[PDB]
Amino acid sequence: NNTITLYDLQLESGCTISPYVWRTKYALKHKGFDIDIVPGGFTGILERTGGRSERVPVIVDDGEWVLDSWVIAEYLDEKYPDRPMLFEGPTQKNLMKFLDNWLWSTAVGPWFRCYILDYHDLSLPQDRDYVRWSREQWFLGGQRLEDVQAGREDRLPLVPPTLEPFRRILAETKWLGGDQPNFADYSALAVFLWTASVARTPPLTEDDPLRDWLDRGFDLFDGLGRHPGMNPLFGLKLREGDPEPFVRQTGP
Amino acid sequence: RNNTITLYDLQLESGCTISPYVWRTKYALKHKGFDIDIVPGGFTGILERTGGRSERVPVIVDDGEWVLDSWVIAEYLDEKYPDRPMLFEGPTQKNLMKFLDNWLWSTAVGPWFRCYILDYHDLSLPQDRDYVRWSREQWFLGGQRLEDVQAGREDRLPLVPPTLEPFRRILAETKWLGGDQPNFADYSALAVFLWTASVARTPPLTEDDPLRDWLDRGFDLFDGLGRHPGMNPLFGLKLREGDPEPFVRQ
Numbered sequence A: 001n002n003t004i005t006l007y008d009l010q011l012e013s014g015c016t017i018s019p020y021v022w023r024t025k026y027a028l029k030h031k032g033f034d035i036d037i038v039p040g041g042f043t044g045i046l047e048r049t050g051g052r053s054e055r056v057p058v059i060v061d062d063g064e065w066v067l068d069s070w071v072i073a074e075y076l077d078e079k080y081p082d083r084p085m086l087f088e089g090p091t092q093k094n095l096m097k098f099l100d101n102w103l104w105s106t107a108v109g110p111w112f113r114c115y116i117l118d119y120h121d122l123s124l125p126q127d128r129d130y131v132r133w134s135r136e137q138w139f140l141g142g143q144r145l146e147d148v149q150a151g152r153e154d155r156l157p158l159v160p161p162t163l164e165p166f167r168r169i170l171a172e173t174k175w176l177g178g179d180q181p182n183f184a185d186y187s188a189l190a191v192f193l194w195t196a197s198v199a200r201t202p203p204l205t206e207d208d209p210l211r212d213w214l215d216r217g218f219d220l221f222d223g224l225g226r227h228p229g230m231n232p233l234f235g236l237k238l239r240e241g242d243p244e245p246f247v248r249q250t251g252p
Numbered sequence B: 001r002n003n004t005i006t007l008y009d010l011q012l013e014s015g016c017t018i019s020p021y022v023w024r025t026k027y028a029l030k031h032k033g034f035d036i037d038i039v040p041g042g043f044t045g046i047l048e049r050t051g052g053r054s055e056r057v058p059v060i061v062d063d064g065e066w067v068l069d070s071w072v073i074a075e076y077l078d079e080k081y082p083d084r085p086m087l088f089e090g091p092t093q094k095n096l097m098k099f100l101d102n103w104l105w106s107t108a109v110g111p112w113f114r115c116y117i118l119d120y121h122d123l124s125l126p127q128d129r130d131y132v133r134w135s136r137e138q139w140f141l142g143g144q145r146l147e148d149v150q151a152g153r154e155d156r157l158p159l160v161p162p163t164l165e166p167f168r169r170i171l172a173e174t175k176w177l178g179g180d181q182p183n184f185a186d187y188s189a190l191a192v193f194l195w196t197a198s199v200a201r202t203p204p205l206t207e208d209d210p211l212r213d214w215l216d217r218g219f220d221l222f223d224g225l226g227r228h229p230g231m232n233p234l235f236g237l238k239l240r241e242g243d244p245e246p247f248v249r250q
């Protein structure tokens, strides 16, 4: 106290990649905790923990271990109601997962195949082999990463328009949590925080309306999403035949 | 004023509510524990039935407070009656609700609107048919005549259920969208299906659709609020050899 251990999933730059670990970091600062970060990558997770977990994030409040970012979030609300609440209620949880799933299908799905080689290259040296064969065979490929990430210049322009349903919401609220952010924002923001960690070329345009909520979210808690290894999410340059990245409209 | 709140309805010929905005208002009102003085009527004459106060329903009249727009009504009920069960649990629900509702209207209402627009028309009040005809043809282009839009729904309807899977995924891990008890999130989502049921003269879903559990319990809420004599079964869609699989069975 006032510290909680956090088993991180970091790239070679020490920059967090896992959105599950991202929203946990955010969930902890939201609660006003200090984070004792345990650095580590994809490989050797089970050994870093006391043989307690094959996945991260994992927190160790005092001595109590807590696995799974969602459980951890629910745990922080459980044991610390005095601190700023992560969940607004049961209805947020259900509606969150709907938005979360939608962001994973719409943003993570494409961007994953657009940054999988960068994802691999930016990883710690000890992870590169593991990340190589597992990702390109299970999720999958079926062939190698260089072949999947190839042609991303053509794929990336098609993602921004599909995000419009999410732009529609943020156009009428500062945060998903209302006037202040909560786990809804951090859960959704994790998507872009992960993207920013592996995007060696920006997936969004400069003037994307998402940027307001994004820059604000990344700036939260003394720039929690402003790690040195974080790449810019904005800077995508489109062609004549590309779709409009977002609805340019105003506004009664 | 006893326990009664007046509600200007949008009814079909059978007296069954069609508008999803009115549906979620009914549910929101019953959820608050209010009795509803239903002012019947249809698409035509809304200005006349109201005090020239609105051209659109739902509209409630609490004591003397006229409240317009289903969303504003729900918030008004939460604002004025915090002692009665809440409709929203806070700002976060509202924002994520809008996202879900938007997805439901893009995924369910849109396709089903085209597939049931002639039934929609045929089921409306006789003094509304031509208006609904003239209105929906010049506006929701859709387009050609109502017949041409609904034409070939037998090919279009089987394509909708699979796209509803992202919604089933949530309901497979919760009793209601609002936890153990439903709220406006449930009612708002249910309204899409309440609207469909009021006009669907052929079932859009299969008998075994995982949504059925949440839907039936939802339609049954508040003394069968969604079980008006005019409703049609949402379930009974007969799939053919070529039709896709309507839902994940895992």
Ligand SMILES: N[C@@H](CCC(=O)N[C@@H](CS)C(=O)NCC(=O)O)C(=O)O
Binding pocket: A009, A018, A019, A020, A021, A042, A043, A045, A054, A055, A056, A057, A067, A068, A069, A070
């Ligand atoms: N149950 C975890 C999911 C953990 C997880 O899937 N982590 C990924 C990062 S995206 C990972 O570590 N993959 C490699 C591994 O399993 O070791 C949560 O939701 O918090």
Ligand SMILES: N[C@@H](CCC(=O)N[C@@H](CS)C(=O)NCC(=O)O)C(=O)O
Binding pocket: B010, B019, B020, B021, B022, B043, B044, B046, B055, B056, B057, B058, B068, B069, B070, B071
């Ligand atoms: N502002 C209302 C929407 C009202 C509305 O769009 N009503 C439709 C029913 S789908 C209607 O009556 N359309 C024909 C008309 O305006 O008379 C709300 O969101 O609650």
